[PDB]
Each structure stands twice: as C-alpha cells, then as structure tokens.
C-alpha cells in the first residue's frame, strides 16, 4: 500500500501530494517522485490519474524546484 493504488474519491489524491508533479504533456496525468534512492536516483512512477490515486506515503504540500528533477 506504499505504492500508488486506485481509491475512488480519496481524501488524499496524488494531485495534492508533495511528491507528485504533473505529467510533461497531459496535466490529467502525474509523476510520483517519492521513490528516492540513496545514490541520488529519483525513480519516478507514472500516474494515470491524480484525483483517484493515493498511497501511504501521501503528504500534502509542495516541494521547491530544488528538490524535483
């Protein structure tokens, strides 16, 4: 449950999560940046839908550009 999963009408959508940044082409989609490796990798996961997806790592907020790719 620490990986993205569907949860219709969730109180904690990816859209509001600090780890999410929108897809480069389609703003209906998202990029989960939560999987950060000790050697520096930011191992993204593609989000088909950011209104009805969530995981246990959800944390409301916004990272500055410094912490994104």
């Amino acid at each position: 449950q620490n990986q993205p999963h569907t949860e219709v009408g969730t109180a904690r959508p990816c859209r509001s999560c600090k780890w999410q940044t929108p897809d480069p082409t389609d703003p209906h989609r998202g990029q989960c940046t939560a999987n950060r490796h000790a050697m520096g990798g930011v191992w993204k996961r593609w989000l088909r839908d950011v209104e009805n997806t969530t995981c246990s790592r959800h944390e409301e907020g916004k990272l500055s550009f410094r912490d994104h790719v």
Partner: protein, 857 residues
C-alpha cells in the same frame, strides 16, 4: 600546479596574480564587468524568467491573457475568410490591441506580453499545454475567461487537427516522454530561423509594395482572355497569401510605431531628466522608421532585429531559439556606424554596450512553453542560440570586429543566455579566437565550437534533395547557423528553416534499450506496453538477438517521431499560416506561398538523447552475458527488476565493463557500429516532407535528466531514476578514466550517418586560467578539428565553487555553467541536475596529452 613537458616546467599559476589567493569556491563572483553604468543597472534589475522542474523559479513570473483574448476575438470575427487571411487578422488584432511596455534605462525596446513580468500563451497550438497553465500558480487571469478561451480553441487546435491520424496507443506512448519526445503538435514547442536579412536591408514597406504588385498582377492574369482553368486557379492561394502578408506587415509597422510613440509620450510627460528625454526621443525616431524602412545604422539594425525576433518567436507563433548569424548579419551596419560613421556614429565600445543590452532583453524574454519544456532547460528562460565566426562564400574568414564586440559583450555582462556557437575553421583570425577563449576560460560554457567544413558540406549534401531544385548553392552553403543547440541550417533572405516540423524533436535510446529486455513493456515507469513486442527474454538467445530487438524498438519509435512531425507540417501550412514570416522570405514572397508550405532547403533531423547509456549497456551485456557467460539474461533481468538490491556485486561488474570515452577497442568497436548502423543508419532510411533524409543530431539539453528519472536500472550500472549521459556522444559522467585525449580518440571514430553530435568536456580551471591556457586550448581545437569531430563545448568551473553554491545559493548568483547545448545560472538548476554537472570529469592534461595535441610552449 606544475607539469614537465618537453624539458620545460610549466607553471599553472593564474594570469591575474590576484587570483592566486581568491578562494577557489568564489572565483566567478569576481569576473563581471558591464561596460557602462547603464548595463550594470540593467543587469542588477534584470527580470529573469528562468524555469526548472516544470515551474518558474520566481513567483512574480506569470502568464498573460491579452494574446489569448485578442487572438480569440479575431478568430470569431474572421469565420469564412481564407485561413491565411484569418491568421494575418489574428496577429493584427493582437498587435493592434496589445498593451506595450517601456522600462527604465532601456535602449532596445519592446516586449511580447502586457506586463514585463509576463509572457503570452498559445491556445491555437496545444489545448493540453493551456490546461496545464490553468492548473498552475501562474495561470492567466481571469481564470474563467482563460478557461472559456481554451474550450473555444480546443476543436480548432493544431493538437486536435493532428491526433486523428495516429493510433491512440501510439500517441499515449509518445506523450509520456520516456522513449520518444512528445510530438510538437501536442506540446506547441517549435523553432525557427527568421530571414532577418530581408527585414534589415529592405524594410517592411517595400515588402508590402511588393505583395501588392503581385496581387495586381495575379488579378490581371485571372481576367486575361483566354482563361485557362488548369493555370488560373493557382492565383487563388497566391492572392490569399499575399493579402495576408500585407495585413501582417502593416500591423507590425503600426505596432513598432506605437512602441515608438510610448517612448515619445514618456519623454514628454513622465521622464524628468533631459538626458533620458533626448535618448527616449532618439529611440522614438528609430521606432518610427524601423522596421518600415531599410536600416541605416547599428542602432536601427539592433532594434529591427529585436522586433523581428518578437514577432517570429513569440507573437505570431511560439518558437524556441534565437538562430541567426549575428556577426555577418550586423556587419554592414556596424561598418556604417562604427567604422565609416555615416549614420548613427558610434565607438566600438558603444557597439559592445548595445550588444550587452540585447543580451539583457533576451534574458528578460519569458517563454510561454509547455510543462515538458519548463522541465528540460533548467536554469534558463528558454533556448537562445546565436552563431558567429565560420567562413564566407569564398571560403575565407568570416570573423570581424562585430564578432569581437559580440564576444566581449558576453564576457562582460555574464548572462546565461543567449548562448553562442562559434563555427571554427583554420581560416579564423587569432584575435577572434582569443575572444572566444576569454569567454570559455571564464566558465560561461560558450561559445560552443562547431566544425565549419562539416556543416558546410552538410548544407551542400541536403541541397541536392531540394523539391524545386533550389537548395543552397555551393556559396550559400557557407551561410549556416545552428537552428537550436546543435543542428546546422541555412541563414539569409531565403531557404531558412521555418518550423521544428522540418527537423528537431528527440528519441531516447536508454528507454528503448530498457524495454528491449522486457518485450517492449515498460515495467519501471509507466507499467504498460511502450513499444512493439520484440521478443521475451528467452527468445534473446544471442547478442545479435538483443541488437535486433533494440533495432526494432528504434525503428518503431523513429517512424512515429518523423511521421508526427510531417503530419504537423501538413496542418501548420493549412491552418497555422505565418504571413509575417512568409512576407520576409524571398521565396515565399516570389511564389505566393506560406512559410510552412514552401521548403527549398531540406534539413531533416531528429535528436538521439541518452544514446551512451544504451551503448554502454549493450557493451556490458555482450561482455558479461554472452562472451564470458558470467551471468544469464534472466539473472541480469532479475537484478534489474530488483533495482540491483541484493545484487551489488553484479552491478559493480556491469559498471566496470568497458565504457565509451576511454579509447578502448572493445567498447568503441561496438559503440561505433551502434551510432553508424543503428542510430544514424536506420534513421536515414526515412525521408521527410522536404524530400531529404533524416539524420541524427546527438544531444541532451535537460532531457538526459528527465528521461533518466523515467528510466529503470540499466546494464551500464545505473540505478533506476539516475541521470543518463549528458551529451550526444559524451562519456557517461565519471566513466572516462583515461584523460581528455582518450576521449577525443573515442569520439573521432563515429564518422558516418550523423548530422551532428554534442560533446561536453570539462577542463581544469588552473590550466585554462594560466598563461598557457590559450595555447593548450587552441591546440586542443586544432587537433579536434583534424580528427573531424563535429562539436565540443566546455565547462571551466571548480567543484568547490559548485558545492559552495549549493550550500549558499544567495552568495553565488553569478555562477554560470554549461548544461548541454545551453548555459544556465547554476543556483537556478535543481539539486539533481546540479549534481550531474559536478560529476562530470574535470580533465587534466598529462605531458603525453599535450604531445598528442602538438602543443608548443
């Protein structure tokens, strides 16, 4: 510090004795010297609009709505009219109604949105890009109007016109920007080479009078007895295009003159200092005459060029870039002003100041580009690459005192943009090489260096495929510039590249390799089928099977990449006409054709990015899985699926396998074939709209970062989400262990089927800043040139200083570094990207390196 070479002891102490004791970690905060109090002021208050990670760095930068509003009003009003005329009416309405901007201390004036903190949007291009803006903190306002506007344009958008000709599954794959860059019709991203030469030396009034004459002749033709319906109907599209050119040009003149009137009004009603008042009236007069009339002096030319740039790159349509041959373009006007003093008399230092001001206006140009294109140029506004140097029509030196003014302005003002490309020939005068080096040794990252003869030959080769047999003449083939970062294209009054649909856009070998090992399935980023089902792991029984699977993945991807560009071309010329650009192209004007329809000089290319990750991965697979049989593919694949966790000894084996850039036979034999046979060889089988081949321009911008983050672990030793290689042909960071001339030797082996390839190298600060710096660098370049290498560009920056700027960004505002094909303000790059630049090997030269370069001290 000290090196022994040919029986001498070389001392690498800095040329300025003061630098002996300036801490290494703050060097670049000491180097700017704006030529005047004014350009110093302009820099201190510069309205930079850098974007990284998909966002603007500063909260104050935000989207405008005027362009959206007035384009929409015009489109509704022009229903039923010919499309080319509808497009001209749209631009005219935008120009007629736009709020204009004048800023303090400016001499070159003008802007492309309704407020100096803003930038315009493009609902006619990508409805998704606009929707993304509406969902951002920097949305146009009022949001409700902007939303209504986007809903109005959606069925008419270029994106909506092009999508129906492709399998939805294929578009979904491209739109992810993991194995293929999204097509331009889906993002709105674009580029252009404006025929500036036409505007500066004819003025727009002449173009109008010319279109009017063509129209009168065509209407006369249509009423001549006896009519011939197989000929006379050709006049319809011509007359439509010419009428559109007239509407566009008249609107541009009117807008320039209204900009001029704002200078007059401020001088007479707002400005209290008589000095500035006089200056404002001087600018007002220039704007009254220019670009309506031919330019007479350098101030005219600079302002004409800026106005043309705003129309072509921002207002008529979005286009990335700043392509132009700036020294050759401005030379006649420099000569008139500075040398002959015939009009707008000026000193050389006055010219240097005017160029500084130009660099500062471009530094303020915010770009209304889509989320992807706010991700992949971290630390800059956009790509702005101008070209200087090279050779003239007779093959002689094109360098001149205007080239030197442009280089000195760059060294002095220290802005990350615009970047510069220097076309290097053995013809080029040393006086100008020294200025090129002054920029590089100061760590600006530019001029990058392009091989002059390679580019010129290239122009001749493409010219042969011209669909109307009017490609570049042999003399014209010397007239070239880089279009964006890397690819040559013709400049001048005619035959320039009008759209990124001709050439540009990227493809990502590292991701293609990853899914090659999983039957086309992307398990790591998107969890879906990303390419064709080219064979499961068990079917890959030999290295040749792995090679062929990659080949098929690449063929599937590159076909979509080019076909989506050609479909976009088809609709751009039908619904996104550019009558202003058409009016200033001699061929378009002569033939009554739209700028996107007419294509006299083919220039097809696509960009392989993350190539060396794929290539190193293939080398390691061959050695460890198939030659030595130390691991099975199932063992590798299990390890990869684990992100190497539990498999660190396997990871280190694959990491230490032979790597590109070490002049190592085993790696280089495989990788040379990979470039020539697959990357170039397969692409070149494709023919584009213009009837020429498509060849690769290896490069990277910031996509090597973004695609890295969307790519799983790979057999070169990467963990999932780590950066890819930084160039078109650079060694992967930290894997080149044999020094700088070993790198040249590897790179020189790739000679067939390429259009260009970006090489990033990073040189030791003490050597470059010592009194021996120029000699070693000039020898490096001579040698690089003899090896027939396409490109090279340099970082000259200490790791200490970059780490200090990470800790305390507010103390390191003037630190500029090279990313890939463009330069950036280091503190405006995200940490992830900053670390990839720190990891690039700082190259030292051994005495054997220096002998290889034939250095003489």
């Amino acid at each position: 510090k000290v090196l022994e070479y040919k029986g001498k002891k070389l001392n690498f102490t800095p040329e300025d004795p003061a630098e002996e004791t300036i801490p290494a970690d703050e060097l670049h905060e000491h180097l700017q010297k704006p030529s005047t109090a004014r350009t110093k002021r302009l820099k201190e208050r510069c309205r930079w609009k850098h974007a990284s990670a998909g966002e603007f760095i500063e909260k104050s930068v935000t989207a405008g709505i005027e362009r959206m509003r007035y384009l929409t009003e015009a489109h509704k009003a022009s229903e039923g009219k010919p499309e080319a005329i509808r497009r001209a009416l749209g631009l005219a309405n935008v120009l007629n109604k736009s709020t204009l901007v004048l800023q303090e201390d400016e001499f070159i004036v003008g802007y492309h949105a309704e407020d100096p903190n803003m930038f315009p949007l493009y609902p006619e291009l990508s409805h998704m890009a606009v929707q993304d803006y509406l969902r951002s903190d920097y949305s146009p306002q009022p949001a409700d109007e902007a939303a209504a506007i986007n809903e109005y344009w959606k069925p008419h958008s270029l994106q909506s016109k092009c999508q129906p000709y492709f399998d939805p599954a294929d578009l979904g794959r491209m739109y992810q920007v993991s194995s293929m860059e999204a097509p331009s019709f889906a993002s709105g991203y674009n580029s252009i080479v404006p025929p500036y030469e036409t505007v500066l030396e004819d003025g727009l009034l002449a173009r109008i009078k010319l279109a009017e004459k063509h129209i009168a002749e065509a209407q006369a033709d249509m009423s001549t007895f006896p009519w011939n319906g197989t000929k006379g109907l050709d006049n319809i599209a011509k007359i439509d295009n010419w009428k559109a050119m007239v509407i566009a040009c008249k609107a541009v003149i009117s807008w320039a003159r209204r900009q001029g009137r704002l200078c007059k009004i401020v001088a007479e009603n707002f400005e209290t200092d008589p000095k500035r008042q006089a200056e404002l009236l001087e600018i007002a007069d220039i704007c009254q005459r220019i670009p309506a009339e031919p330019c007479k002096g350098l101030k005219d030319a600079m302002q004409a060029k800026f106005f043309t740039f705003l129309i072509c790159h921002a207002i008529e349509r979005y286009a990335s870039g700043y392509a132009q041959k700036e020294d050759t373009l401005l030379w006649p006007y420099y000569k008139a002003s500075v040398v002959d003093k015939k009009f707008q008399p000026m000193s050389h230092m006055d010219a240097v100041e005017l160029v500084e001001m130009e660099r500062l206006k471009i530094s303020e140009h915010g770009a209304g580009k889509s989320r992807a294109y706010r991700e992949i140029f971290p630390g800059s506004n956009d790509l702005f690459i101008l070209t200087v140097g090279g050779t003239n029509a007779k093959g002689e030196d094109a360098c001149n005192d205007m080239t030197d003014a442009i280089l000195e302005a760059a060294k002095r003002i220290r802005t990350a943009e615009p970047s510069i490309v220097f076309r290097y020939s053995k013809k080029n005068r040393e006086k100008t090489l020294r200025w090129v080096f002054e920029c590089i040794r100061d760590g600006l990252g530019y001029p990058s260096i392009k091989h002059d003869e390679i580019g010129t030959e290239q122009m001749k080769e493409y010219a042969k495929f011209s669909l109307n047999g009017n490609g570049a003449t042999d003399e014209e083939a010397h007239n070239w510039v880089n279009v964006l970062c890397m690819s040559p294209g013709i400049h001048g009054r005619r035959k320039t590249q009008k759209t990124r649909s001709e050439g540009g856009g990227s493809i990502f070998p590292a991701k293609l390799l990853e899914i090659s090992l999983n039957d086309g399935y992307d398990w790591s980023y998107a969890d879906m089928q990303l390419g064709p089902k080219t064979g499961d792991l068990s079917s890959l029984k030999s290295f040749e099977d792995v090679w062929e699977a990659f080949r098929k993945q690449y063929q599937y991807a590159i076909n979509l990449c080019i076909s989506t560009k050609d479909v976009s071309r088809y609709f751009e010329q039908r619904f996104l006409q550019m009558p202003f650009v058409s009016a200033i192209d001699d061929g378009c004007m002569e033939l009554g054709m739209d700028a996107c329809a007419l294509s006299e000089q083919p220039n097809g290319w696509h960009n392989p990015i993350t190539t060396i990750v794929a290539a190193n991965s293939l080398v390691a697979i061959k050695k460890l899985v198939f030659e030595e049989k130390k691991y099975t593919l199932e063992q590798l694949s299990q390890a990869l699926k684990a992100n190497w966790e539990g498999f660190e000894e396997m990871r280190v084996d694959f990491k230490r396998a032979p790597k590109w850039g070490n002049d190592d036979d085993y790696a280089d034999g495989i990788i040379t074939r990979f470039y020539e046979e697959i990357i170039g060889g397969e692409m070149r089988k494709i023919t584009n709209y213009s009837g020429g081949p498509v060849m690769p321009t290896g490069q990277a911008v910031g996509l090597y970062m973004e695609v890295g983050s969307r790519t799983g672990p790979t057999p070169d030793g990467r963990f999932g989400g780590e950066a890819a290689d930084d160039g078109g042909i650079s060694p992967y960071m930290g894997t080149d262990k044999k020094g700088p001339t070993a790198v040249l030797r590897s790179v020189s082996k790739v000679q067939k089927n390429q259009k260009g390839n970006l090489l990033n190298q990073r040189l030791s600060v003490p050597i470059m800043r010592s009194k021996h710096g120029f000699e070693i660098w000039n020898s490096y370049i001579k040698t690089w040139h003899d090896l027939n290498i396409d490109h090279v560009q340099f970082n000259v920056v200490s790791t200490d200083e970059m780490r200090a700027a990470q800790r305390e960004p507010e103390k390191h505002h003037d630190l500029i570094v090279r990313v890939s094909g463009y330069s950036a303000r280091f503190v405006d790059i995200p940490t992830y990207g900053q670390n990839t630049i720190i990891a690039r090997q700082e190259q030292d030269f051994s005495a054997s390196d220096l002998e290889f370069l034939n250095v003489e001290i």
